[PDB]
């Protein structure tokens with residue numbers, strides 16, 4: 001399976017910056033969502049989940065085809081809650097109907113990260129919608145109740161190494177878990193992209209408790225939580241070193257996250273040698289908007 005990026009006809013940087021701006025303006029407008037967290041975190045999760053179906057072995061899944069729009073993937077139990085992100089993007093797609101679904105979902109994640117004061121994430125266009133029969137089966141996204149070995153093995157399927165995994169997981173600084181979505185509850189309400197996930201792991205007093213869904217999670221006195229898979233990053237000595245690294249260097253985390261997140265969003269895509277360079281979008285703040 002080869003998926004070749006094909007630029008939406010006649011479109012260039014300015015077109016996608018307009019889409020970015022529309023997403024960013026709506027992020028600012030619809031600020032009440034999820035107890036005033038806003039839609040930032042769920043858009044980041046959406047971009048990750050539409051990418052995280054990828055399988056390096058046969059190039060099935062991945063962001064390219066925009067298959068989350070199809071019921072099988074939309075209704076994946078692993079994707080519970082992401083419907084809110086999709087609904088958010090509906091008026092954006094209506095205003096810019098020329099953008100492909102994969103481009104829109106991935107761009108949503110990039111926009112959210114940047115607007116939440118995270119690192120720049122270079123982004124490339126050219127994902128092309130593929131038919132309903134290309135939708136990957138449910139079950140390719142990760143379980144949260146497992147250990148470091150599970151996480152390591154899981155991410156090998158996405159061609160991610162230890163540093164890439166630990167960097168990507170830093171997105172768990174954002175938003176929260178919702179009992180009705182995933183069987184986990186809590187996490188606060190952060191919508192600013194920082195390295196705080198690593199600081200929280202290292203600095204908080206964690207207790208292994210059971211939540212109201214009878215699942216174990218790690219809770220701190222201060223009211224934070226970590227999934228078992230989050231906490232596994234300080235149980236494994238190789239992950240732990242990297243956690244400490246990012247806890248002590250905000251810039252290094254930003255740079256590594258940016259690389260890993262772009263890679264995640266681009267897995268499975270062949271870019272022609274003469275494709276445009278990756279775009280780096282200006283934030284609303286940078287534009288004075």
Ligand code: HEM
Nearest residue numbers: 041042044045048142143144168171175176177178181182
């Ligand atoms: C082992 C890997 C991972 C596991 C098991 C996992 C699991 C989860 C679970 C269970 C939730 C709560 C969903 C809910 O109840 O609403 C969540 C939330 C979230 N995840 Fe992950 N995740 C993983 C990796 C990632 C990665 C790689 C990213 C992005 C780079 C990411 C981004 C997010 C974000 C932003 C939220 C908050 C969503 C919201 O506030 O609505 N996660 N994750």
Ligand SMILES: OCc1cnc2cc[nH]c2c1
Nearest residue numbers: 172174175176187224225
């Ligand atoms: O409490 C911190 C926190 C916030 N959000 C998430 C998402 C997964 N694990 C998390 C942990």
